[model samples]
Target: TDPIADMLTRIRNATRVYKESTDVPASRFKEEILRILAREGFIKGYERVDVDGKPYLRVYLKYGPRRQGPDPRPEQVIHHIRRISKPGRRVYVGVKEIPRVRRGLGIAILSTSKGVLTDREARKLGVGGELICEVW
Candidate 1:
């Protein structure tokens, strides 16, 4: 009856382990963030876009059984966070957006006062904002 709660508890515990690991050196905090997504089955692969793109990584999350299919439910809620990038530097936390997509399952871009963020990041911060658009 508490599936979500159980998953959240496991996530919290994993986060604690990540936080306490001093020997594990990460080039950027975003990498650790992605690790969380991987743990939760949110992301499959990530990469930095552009050679001089300030070392930003693109995170991808695909839902449903197949890559393309109609959503079986009325509401599909996704959480994401907005990231601010500086020239030739890593990303910084800005805001979060939690979006609920209905009708069908698709990728929706998340936008905030600062800029756009991936759904995974938005969910982490528990902040809600404007829905950029939807894609199927």
Candidate 2:
């Protein structure tokens, strides 16, 4: 019932293994989410490509800047991507109630009256809608 969840999971799982990029069946919503992630430095970027005669979104994962061995700085950029809203237990929020993921170390994505935006942007615009997901 939820293609959004599937989209998030595919990116998360592929990124878990250091994949450069992955594709999801295209939808404007999903593409916008990827765009927001790109804006927030959560990913490299995304693009539209055709697959089997259908449109798809290609999302690139950022592993981090190249560093020397024994630096101990992990290459993985994203630690977690948690989906907030679900079909059964829908979670709605106002500008005043968005949760700060990781105490400001992470970013939360939301669908608002205007469009899909990050937690900070939604608050700035004084609007809110469904809580989509969080990335840290």
Candidate 3:
């Protein structure tokens, strides 16, 4: 339970940071958040990969034989859903526009009305800002 709670906390914190700092659209953050969560193991069986030169991650809750037409064979089910869900039977964390952060401090630059600050700094100021998602 503690680990689960911790994961949620990290997600919330990252979401806040990312929301406040980045100028990009909110939709862009979803995949970024998923990537952070997967890397942190908040969710299970997630994988990060580079597709066509862009990096992204995938998440999934369950895997096994896909059921088709009232319990069709697993291989058949895979073929049935292959066109739509061919990316390894996993949920995809699509391409996201992540913020650029300082290399060593795990601090990302965020945009604020008063200019920019690191995500950590923004959090201290009582701001529920952007999702400065992190993997560590």
On TM-score, the leading prediction is: 2
Per-model TM-score, in order, reads: 0.29, 0.91, 0.22
Angstrom error at residue 77, model 2: 1.1
Per residue, candidate 1 scores C-alpha lDDT tens digits across 21-63 of 1111223544544554445454454555534534545444433
Global lDDT of each model? Answer: 0.39, 0.87, 0.35
Evaluate model 1: give its TM-score: 0.29
Candidate no. 3 TM-score: 0.22
Candidate 2 Cα outliers beyond 4 Å, as residue runs: 66-74
Q: Across residues 69-118, which tens digit of lDDT does each residue of candidate 2 receive?
A: 77744477777898889889889998888878789988999998889989
Model 2 score (lDDT): 0.87
Measured with C-alpha atoms, the lDDT of residue 69 in candidate 1 is 52
Which pairs of residues clash in candidate 2, taking residues 3 or more apart in a chain or in different chains? none
Judged by lDDT, which candidate is best?
A: 2
Measured on C-alpha atoms, candidate 1 has an lDDT of: 0.39
Residue 34 error, candidate 2, Å: 0.5
